[PDB]
Design a protein around this ligand. Structure first.
Ligand SMILES: Nc1ccn([C@@H]2O[C@H](CO)[C@@H](O)[C@H]2O)c(=O)n1
Ligand SMILES: Nc1ccn([C@@H]2O[C@H](CO)[C@@H](O)[C@H]2O)c(=O)n1
Ligand SMILES: Nc1ccn([C@@H]2O[C@H](CO)[C@@H](O)[C@H]2O)c(=O)n1
Ligand SMILES: O=c1ccn([C@@H]2O[C@H](CO)[C@@H](O)[C@H]2O)c(=O)[nH]1
Ligand SMILES: [N]
Ligand SMILES: [Zn+2]
Ligand SMILES: [Zn+2]
Ligand SMILES: [Zn+2]
Ligand SMILES: [Zn+2]
Lengths: 137, 135, 134, 137
């Protein structure tokens, strides 16, 4: 709850929420992805007049990192305005996370700084993945 | 669910796989959803030249059912040609399933008829859902 | 473009489909109905999700239903909404899905009073990316 | 010779193509987004074992810009390995672009550097947009 990298994750995630583009849901979400070498990529949800075309904070962050060449992820924290609920990643974000590993941490936070940690494997058990298309050889 | 419906659901899932439009991945998937009153709705994956625009069998089936006024689901079965492993729903499909409850059954099968069952809740722990947007 | 009879049936079907719309978040109901080459009709409605990006449009619900039942030859698709002074137009993602199955078919963008504007898929998605690209 | 900003866009778009994560299609795509103040944001397609969960280069680039506070877009260029055919944005990407304006440019290129430029409006006529969702009408 207080290791340096945890503090960094929570602060960045909380800060990233400020850039959210969510005029439809008015539900801002921020995310901060921590890579293996210590770099942090932030993200926020970006909605669309046509709801299906919006994107979640977690994926905004992951897509940013990958586009810049980072594919080794250590952890990701998520922030929202819900004070009485730990903000949890939707199934779609869990699947994208899984595309890059099942062994990394997801910090589901509350505005007060408290949080619950679960791995991608735990958040997406018996996961569909690269193996289904026989891509691991 | 009733073994009578279980079998009908499992076969419906495989038959649906025949209509799959998947020229890009060449990975056909079929699904069949059983509603509270016994009606079954099936679906298949439908790809698109631009990959993100494709849709999964599970959601094709769920969307079909909802469009007909059915939102009470008891179970959903999934089928593919993957021999080495039970076919499981991707995270996106799990989230759509969750929109309509966490206590129902998901049948992940193999081409030989064997399968494993898990509830939506077990497939999507600590899930985000409608409650997050209430109050 | 097709006969006023098929157009009317498409019209009534999309409006009727719109009644099943699951849209508690936007409270913006949308209905759609498409006509296959052999004259069959398949309809759909938008179906949203707590996580907005996982919702689906009425057009794609209709299209996906038809395909799942073996139909891939489409002649026309009609869209209906509750917008009074706006012809409801298909979003870009729906146009791309429509394109996957041809560019030479009609899209009927209607208003609640039955008035409409019809354009081909090609006209709604010019210089489109398609199966040929791959 | 092309205007300075056009050369930058074309080259950045071509470069972003290298970070493409596309093991399923093996069809790399790069994008470069030019903002009103001159900053360029790049993107690449990032696929998923479950095809529908992938993202296009154009949205990867647009999401990166927005996540950092940039919504004023001037132009975006797309690059691919398709030698004889200008790479055009899919319909989903055109809708995301439209969320932030219809009067800006889209540069559809080929590897040799030649291109066709159309506005978002021209690529997505009679578009559905934020306006259709305004409560007062
Ligand atoms: N022509 C379109 C445009 C929008 N929609 C649906 O309307 C809601 C708000 O974008 C979302 O539910 C979206 O899917 C639709 O079904 N068809
Ligand atoms: N953990 C999650 C959950 C939700 N969201 C975003 O919040 C809005 C409502 O679901 C939508 O904008 C949705 O994308 C998110 O970005 N990350
Ligand atoms: N102009 C476009 C067209 C396609 N793509 C990406 O290419 C792959 C096959 O459609 C998929 O990875 C798809 O996202 C893209 O990124 N931009
Ligand atoms: O949730 C699953 C996972 C994957 N697929 C489909 O399998 C193919 C491989 O990704 C795609 O067409 C994808 O939609 C399903 O239908 N359901
Ligand atoms: N699946
Ligand atoms: Zn998500
Ligand atoms: Zn799926
Ligand atoms: Zn649409
Ligand atoms: Zn695209």
């Amino acid at each position: 709850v207080e290791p340096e990298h945890v503090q960094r994750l929570l602060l960045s995630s909380r800060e990233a929420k400020k850039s959210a583009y969510c005029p439809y849901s008015r539900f801002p979400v921020g995310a901060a992805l921590l890579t293996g070498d210590g770099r942090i990529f932030s993200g926020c949800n970006i909605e669309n007049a046509c709801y299906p075309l919006g994107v979640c904070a977690e994926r905004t962050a992951i897509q940013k990192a990958i586009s810049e060449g980072y594919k080794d992820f250590r952890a990701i924290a998520i922030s929202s305005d819900l004070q009485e609920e730990f903000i949890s990643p939707c199934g779609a974000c869990r699947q994208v996370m899984r595309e890059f590993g099942t062994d990394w941490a997801v910090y589901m936070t509350k505005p007060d700084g408290t949080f619950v940690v679960r791995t991608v494997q735990e958040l997406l058990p018996a996961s569909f993945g690269p193996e289904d298309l026989q891509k691991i050889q």
